[PDB]
Amino acid sequence: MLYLVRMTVNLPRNLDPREEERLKASAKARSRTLQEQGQWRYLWRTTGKYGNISVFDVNSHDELHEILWSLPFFPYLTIDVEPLSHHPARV
Amino acid sequence: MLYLVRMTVNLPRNLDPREEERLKASAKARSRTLQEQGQWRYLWRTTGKYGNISVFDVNSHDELHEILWSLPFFPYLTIDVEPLSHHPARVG
Amino acid sequence: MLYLVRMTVNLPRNLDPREEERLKASAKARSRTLQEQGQWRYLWRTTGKYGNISVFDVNSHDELHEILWSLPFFPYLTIDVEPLSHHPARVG
Amino acid sequence: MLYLVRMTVNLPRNLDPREEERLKASAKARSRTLQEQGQWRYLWRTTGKYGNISVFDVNSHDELHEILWSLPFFPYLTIDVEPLSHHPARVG
Amino acid sequence: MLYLVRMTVNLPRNLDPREEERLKASAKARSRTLQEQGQWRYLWRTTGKYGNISVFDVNSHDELHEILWSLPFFPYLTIDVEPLSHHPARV
Amino acid sequence: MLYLVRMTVNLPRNLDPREEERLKASAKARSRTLQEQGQWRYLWRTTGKYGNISVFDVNSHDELHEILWSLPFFPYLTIDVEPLSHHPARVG
Amino acid sequence: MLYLVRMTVNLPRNLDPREEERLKASAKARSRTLQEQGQWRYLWRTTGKYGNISVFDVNSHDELHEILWSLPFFPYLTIDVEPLSHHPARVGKD
Amino acid sequence: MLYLVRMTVNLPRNLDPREEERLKASAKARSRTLQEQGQWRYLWRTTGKYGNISVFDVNSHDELHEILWSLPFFPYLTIDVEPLSHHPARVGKD
Amino acid sequence: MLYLVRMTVNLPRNLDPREEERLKASAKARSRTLQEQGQWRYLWRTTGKYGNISVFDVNSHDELHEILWSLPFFPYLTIDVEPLSHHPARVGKD
Amino acid sequence: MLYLVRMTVNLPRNLDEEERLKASAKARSRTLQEQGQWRYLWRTTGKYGNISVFDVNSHDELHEILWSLPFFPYLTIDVEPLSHHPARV
Ligand SMILES: O=C1C=C[C@H]([C@H](Cl)C(=O)O)O1
Ligand SMILES: O=C1C=C[C@H]([C@H](Cl)C(=O)O)O1
Ligand SMILES: O=C1C=C[C@H]([C@H](Cl)C(=O)O)O1
Ligand SMILES: O=C1C=C[C@H]([C@H](Cl)C(=O)O)O1
Ligand SMILES: O=C1C=C[C@H]([C@H](Cl)C(=O)O)O1
Ligand SMILES: O=C1C=C[C@H]([C@H](Cl)C(=O)O)O1
Ligand SMILES: O=C1C=C[C@H]([C@H](Cl)C(=O)O)O1
Ligand SMILES: O=C1C=C[C@H]([C@H](Cl)C(=O)O)O1
Ligand SMILES: O=C1C=C[C@H]([C@H](Cl)C(=O)O)O1
Ligand SMILES: O=C1C=C[C@H]([C@H](Cl)C(=O)O)O1
Ligand SMILES: [Cl-]
Ligand SMILES: [Cl-]
Ligand SMILES: [Cl-]
Ligand SMILES: [Cl-]
Ligand SMILES: [Cl-]
Ligand SMILES: [Cl-]
Ligand SMILES: [Cl-]
Ligand SMILES: [Cl-]
Ligand SMILES: [Cl-]
Ligand SMILES: [Cl-]
Ligand SMILES: [Cl-]
Ligand SMILES: [Cl-]
Numbered sequence: 063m064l065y066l067v068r069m070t071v072n073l074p075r076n077l078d079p080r081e082e083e084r085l086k087a088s089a090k091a092r093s094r095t096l097q098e099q100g101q102w103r104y105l106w107r108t109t110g111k112y113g114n115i116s117v118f119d120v121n122s123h124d125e126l127h128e129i130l131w132s133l134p135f136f137p138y139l140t141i142d143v144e145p146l147s148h149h150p151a152r153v
Numbered sequence: 154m155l156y157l158v159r160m161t162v163n164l165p166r167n168l169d170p171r172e173e174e175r176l177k178a179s180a181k182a183r184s185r186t187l188q189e190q191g192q193w194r195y196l197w198r199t200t201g202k203y204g205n206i207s208v209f210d211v212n213s214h215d216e217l218h219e220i221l222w223s224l225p226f227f228p229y230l231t232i233d234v235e236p237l238s239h240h241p242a243r244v245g
Numbered sequence: 246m247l248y249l250v251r252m253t254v255n256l257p258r259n260l261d262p263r264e265e266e267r268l269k270a271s272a273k274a275r276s277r278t279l280q281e282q283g284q285w286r287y288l289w290r291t292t293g294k295y296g297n298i299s300v301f302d303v304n305s306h307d308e309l310h311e312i313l314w315s316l317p318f319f320p321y322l323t324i325d326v327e328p329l330s331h332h333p334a335r336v337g
Numbered sequence: 338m339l340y341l342v343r344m345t346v347n348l349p350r351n352l353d354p355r356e357e358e359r360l361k362a363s364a365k366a367r368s369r370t371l372q373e374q375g376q377w378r379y380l381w382r383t384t385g386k387y388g389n390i391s392v393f394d395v396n397s398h399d400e401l402h403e404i405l406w407s408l409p410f411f412p413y414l415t416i417d418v419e420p421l422s423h424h425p426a427r428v429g
Numbered sequence: 430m431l432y433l434v435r436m437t438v439n440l441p442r443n444l445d446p447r448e449e450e451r452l453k454a455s456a457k458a459r460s461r462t463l464q465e466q467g468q469w470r471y472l473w474r475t476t477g478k479y480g481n482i483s484v485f486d487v488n489s490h491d492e493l494h495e496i497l498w499s500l501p502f503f504p505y506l507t508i509d510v511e512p513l514s515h516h517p518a519r520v
Numbered sequence: 521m522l523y524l525v526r527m528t529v530n531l532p533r534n535l536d537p538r539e540e541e542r543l544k545a546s547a548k549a550r551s552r553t554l555q556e557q558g559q560w561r562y563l564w565r566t567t568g569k570y571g572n573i574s575v576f577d578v579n580s581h582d583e584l585h586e587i588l589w590s591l592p593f594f595p596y597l598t599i600d601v602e603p604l605s606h607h608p609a610r611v612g
Numbered sequence: 613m614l615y616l617v618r619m620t621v622n623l624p625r626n627l628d629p630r631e632e633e634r635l636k637a638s639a640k641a642r643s644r645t646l647q648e649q650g651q652w653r654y655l656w657r658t659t660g661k662y663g664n665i666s667v668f669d670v671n672s673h674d675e676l677h678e679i680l681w682s683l684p685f686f687p688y689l690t691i692d693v694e695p696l697s698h699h700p701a702r703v704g705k706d
Numbered sequence: 707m708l709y710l711v712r713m714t715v716n717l718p719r720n721l722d723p724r725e726e727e728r729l730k731a732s733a734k735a736r737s738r739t740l741q742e743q744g745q746w747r748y749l750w751r752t753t754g755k756y757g758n759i760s761v762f763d764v765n766s767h768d769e770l771h772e773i774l775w776s777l778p779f780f781p782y783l784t785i786d787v788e789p790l791s792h793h794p795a796r797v798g799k800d
Numbered sequence: 801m802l803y804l805v806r807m808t809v810n811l812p813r814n815l816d817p818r819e820e821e822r823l824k825a826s827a828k829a830r831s832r833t834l835q836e837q838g839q840w841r842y843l844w845r846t847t848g849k850y851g852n853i854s855v856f857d858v859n860s861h862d863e864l865h866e867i868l869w870s871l872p873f874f875p876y877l878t879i880d881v882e883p884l885s886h887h888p889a890r891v892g893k894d
Numbered sequence: 895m896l897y898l899v900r901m902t903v904n905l906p907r908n909l910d911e912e913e914r915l916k917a918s919a920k921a922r923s924r925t926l927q928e929q930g931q932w933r934y935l936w937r938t939t940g941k942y943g944n945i946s947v948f949d950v951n952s953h954d955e956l957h958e959i960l961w962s963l964p965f966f967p968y969l970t971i972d973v974e975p976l977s978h979h980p981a982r983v
């Protein structure tokens with residue numbers, strides 16, 4: 063099942079760059095796994111912005127929430143989720 | 154290069170049922186050609202709505218515009234365009 | 246999968262009388278089927294408004310789309326769709 | 338009577354992690370008894386977000402307010418309340 | 430139980446003169462009955478606009494929906510409903 | 521003349537319990553006075569929310585502003601003001 | 613007392629130039645009277661837009677409503693009304 | 707040239723009342739100067755709200771920005787700027 | 801001085817295609833003139849949309865309004881206007 | 895190709911330093927304008943921000959540039975592609 067997921071990062075001003083580095087690394091490592099296993103199908107950078115537009119391929123809403131909830135950046139994220147369906151004119 | 158494009162169709166009530174069926178076919182034919190060539194990379198239906206989320210792969214803003222402008226449904230479309238960049242954490 | 250679905254009916258003023266009633270009858274019959282089957286799990290009227298708040302229970306996005314798309318009122322509907330997940334604090 | 342209630346949790350940056358754990362446990366307990374007694378009829382997770390969609394079943398607005406007011410997360414909640422009416426096309 | 434109800438009227442320009450004139454008298458007589466009965470407790474004009482702010486006093490959501498649904502202007506109304514509670518500071 | 525006033529409270533997090541208790545008692549006292557004088561004509565709780573919907577009856581915009589400005593909760597209030605007019609179809 | 617009033621015009625498609633011309637003439641005469649009488653205190657054009665931003669000086673909400681209701685453009689207007697108050701830092705007249 | 711400027715004050719939660727009153731004093735003094743010189747033509751309070759609706763009379767965009775930038779409250783303001791044009795139906799002064 | 805102007809064209813479906821073509825032609829000629837005179841400084845197509853992003857260089861709000869008011873597409877335009885000032889980091893001409 | 899970019903500055907309450915960011919910001923913008931990637935720059939009247947037109951060869955190039963701007967952490971940014979107008983003279 064496909065979902066279009068928009069992520070926008072808003073870091074607290076007082077976030078120690080030490081903590082940001084660790085956060086970035088954890089996020090990168092987490093996303094790698096999810097991509098390799100195919101749950102995180104597409105990942106694009108939103109131009110000019112600290113965030114991304116993604117497509118997730120998972121079996122249930124429950125699975126999606128658990129994944130998104132586990133994302134290292136979750137505390138600082140604004141997230142938009144919407145279902146995608148197969149398009150008849152799709153080739 | 155990549156663009157995220159959202160499309161929402163709004164067909165008028167007084168649309169000749171014959172002109173309507175023609176547009177659905179022209180659109181489907183037009184989208185097929187563009188997908189085959191690669192410029193229309195991804196196409197998905199927005200669940201519950203008459204519209205789509207698309208990803209286009211063209212070499213310039215101008216090239217995207219002319220494509221969108223030429224779409225059969227254009228005069229009934231609400232369109233949002235957004236540039237996508239390569240994400241460093243991207244694998245593959 | 247559960248989806249919270251909000252529907253809002255905006256009929257044309259010029260709509261033929263016997264057609265509108267036939268439309269309400271058709272809609273009622275279609276939702277009856279979907280409710281009996283369980284796919285249309287909950288159905289409430291939005292107070293003071295012509296529409297509803299519903300909870301659909303189906304296997305997939307595709308399944309949901311075909312259902313909604315087939316609804317008699319669809320061409321006159323504004324629809325919001327959002328997925329619902331199991332809540333850990335949910336009792337039983 | 339029924340109310341659709343949306344809740345969104347917005348935790349302070351400086352909040353004590355111990356305090357958060359206590360609130361979560363306290364909120365879970367409060368919600369459990371409200372569900373058991375029949376006031377909190379439905380509870381679902383807003384997929385992707387720290388919040389919920391709920392349906393409350395109470396005898397009045399006043400009763401609903403006192404309940405929402407007493408929720409442990411209340412001071413951190415954005416709440417939207419919407420009355421629901423019985424739908425004529427409702428089966429059962 | 431009290432409800433705050435905002436109504437906005439949008440009569441189409443192609444409305445028959447007689448049909449319209451009649452529609453208005455109907456609306457007035459209906460709101461008169463509902464106010465006399467106490468269900469339509471308060472009624473004010475939204476300054477500068479064709480609409481009203483109202484406070485309804487009914488025994489349930491269903492009772493309110495039926496009343497609004499029955500209003501002569503209903504097909505041309507944009508309606509917002511929200512529940513009101515007793516304030517502990519009310520005198 | 522009449523104004524519809526909506527008030528929504530947003531307490532800063534570092535406002536301690538006694539500060540809130542004292543603020544609440546001040547507001548209650550202030551509103552009692554204003555209601556007894558007839559300037560604060562109606563006051564209802566916005567269900568599920570920290571705030572109210574009110575109707576004020578005063579002689580000018582300046583009178584309303586001075587009143588609102590002096591409310592204990594003012595620095596934490598989001599306030600919406602709109603004038604009300606006598607409705608032709610009003611009975612009373 | 614003062615009200616900030618924004619008006620935006622949306623003409624129907626079937627209102628032709630000759631009729632619009634007469635509507636403008638009617639509107640202009642009605643606003644002249646109200647400006648001369650002091651109820652329409654300030655009137656400005658919203659740059660690039662068919663409409664205006666105005667300050668009215670009238671004695672009650674009821675009074676403002678009837679005035680706006682009687683404007684020739686009223687049926688085609690989107691209207692925003694907003695009360696204004698005397699500002700403590702104000703030097704001069706309102 | 708005239709500009710309709712809306713200003714809304716959004717004080718930081720850690721800004722104590724004493725600092726706020728100090729700021730009000732500077733703002734009142736700064737606005738007095740501009741009003742006396744004529745650049746700050748009109749100034750009204752937005753009823754029920756911490757902010758104002760103003761009309762500025764200046765000779766360029768650059769000049770307007772310079773003025774707004776220097777306002778003591780600037781760091782805590784949300785500002786909407788809107789050019790005003792002469793209205794053909796206007797009777798009297800702008 | 802400079803304004804950023806966004807325009808969106810909303811043509812009715814029932815528009816006589818002959819009229820539509822006349823409008824396109826008139827608009828093209830009108831904008832050509834305004835650009836040649838330097839008042840319409842920049843013109844870009846809003847990608848994927850029937851409209852434009854423009855920068856106008858005129859001497860007053862009133863000059864701008866008159867220009868926009870006379871645009872052939874005006875009756876079908878949604879227009880947003882915003883003044884631009886000199887940036888203290890601008891390298892060269894504005 | 896061209897991009898319309900709106901930037902809005904939201905500096906934290908506490909900031910000494912601020913003029914350091916201003917300096918390195920003015921310096922960075924200078925280079926980018928000389929090279930011609932930052933084609934147009936105007937002040938948003940009454941606001942701490944700018945409207946700019948960037949001229950770069952790809953989305954990727956644009957992002958990298960913006961990402962590196964000294965103010966970026968405090969910026970709210972809107973990006974919008976611009977096409978050639980058939981009525982441009
Ligand atoms: O690598 C990643 C994937 C998500 C996060 C944040 Cl949201 C980002 O997109 O940079 O970091
Ligand atoms: O077949 C197609 C592909 C796009 C168009 C519309 Cl916009 C749609 O998505 O249905 O028709
Ligand atoms: O009976 C029904 C169920 C859905 C439709 C519309 Cl949307 C309605 O809720 O009235 O008609
Ligand atoms: O257990 C609960 C139920 C509601 C609250 C928050 Cl608002 C939530 O997790 O939804 O905590
Ligand atoms: O007389 C009435 C009372 C309500 C309706 C509409 Cl809504 C109105 O005039 O506000 O007609
Ligand atoms: O007693 C009161 C009346 C208003 C204030 C806040 Cl605004 C509230 O409504 O609770 O406190
Ligand atoms: O002369 C006038 C004053 C108001 C009306 C519309 Cl509203 C307008 O501003 O052009 O016509
Ligand atoms: O004295 C003044 C004038 C403007 C500012 C804020 Cl903006 C206000 O109270 O309006 O303070
Ligand atoms: O040729 C032109 C220039 C502006 C108008 C519309 Cl507004 C457009 O940009 O296409 O027509
Ligand atoms: O010199 C500059 C160029 C951009 C930044 C911020 Cl955004 C600005 O003042 O516009 O500082
Ligand atoms: Cl992450
Ligand atoms: Cl198409
Ligand atoms: Cl249906
Ligand atoms: Cl809770
Ligand atoms: Cl009615
Ligand atoms: Cl108070
Ligand atoms: Cl009044
Ligand atoms: Cl008028
Ligand atoms: Cl004050
Ligand atoms: Cl200037
Ligand atoms: Cl100031
Ligand atoms: Cl004009």
Ligand SMILES: [Cl-]
Nearest residue numbers: 827871872873
């Ligand atoms: Cl034009």
Ligand SMILES: [Cl-]
Nearest residue numbers: 919963964965
């Ligand atoms: Cl910068």
